[PDB]
Design a protein around this ligand. Structure first.
Ligand SMILES: CCn1cc(NC(=O)c2ccc(F)cc2)cn1
Length: 165
């Protein structure tokens, strides 16, 4: 199971880890992707997860978009986890670098509540432009299921833990 995590709350855990390496190691039932509405996994966590699947995640995602159209900001879809997990929950947090409503971050985290346990990144953090400290606060105040957060950046992980209220 998950190892080396710091317990933040009853159900939220955090670790300084590369979510791809963490997924390959644990093979969780659900790995969360920091997706965009088009499921175009170009960079950040999405680009890294997709590259780990040898682009199979992108091929599957393009078929999903061709059939269903884009996701909503704050929405999600469950697709295959490929070699990383049983499932990948593609969750679209608001991208503040695209002027998207940061209030949609709570709606984005609500998708995690449909899964009993998840391996996840901080939504809207990194290249999505939101403050990761704010993302962690929304996560702990929204998610009620067991979430294991992987924070790639050591310095950010330390800042998140040391400032956690
Ligand atoms: C650790 C590497 N890294 C940190 C960030 N983000 C921030 O720290 C931040 C802080 C305040 C903001 F208003 C927006 C973003 C993205 N990558």
């Amino acid at each position: 199971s998950f190892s080396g995590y710091l317990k933040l709350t009853d159900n939220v855990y955090i670790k300084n880890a590369d979510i791809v390496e963490e997924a390959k190691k644990v093979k969780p039932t659900v790995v969360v992707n920091a997706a965009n509405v088009y499921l175009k996994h170009g960079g950040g966590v999405a680009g890294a997860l997709n590259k780990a699947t040898n682009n199979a995640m992108q091929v599957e995602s393009d078929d999903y978009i061709a059939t269903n159209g884009p996701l909503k900001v704050g929405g999600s879809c469950v697709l295959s986890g490929h070699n990383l997990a049983k499932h990948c929950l593609h969750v679209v947090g608001p991208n503040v670098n695209k002027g998207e409503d940061i209030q949609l971050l709570k709606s984005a985290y609500e998708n995690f509540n449909q899964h009993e346990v998840l391996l996840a990144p901080l939504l809207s953090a990194g290249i999505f432009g939101a403050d990761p400290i704010h993302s962690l606060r929304v996560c702990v105040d929204t998610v009620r299921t067991n979430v294991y957060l992987a924070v790639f950046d050591k310095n950010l992980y330390d800042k998140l833990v040391s400032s956690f209220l």
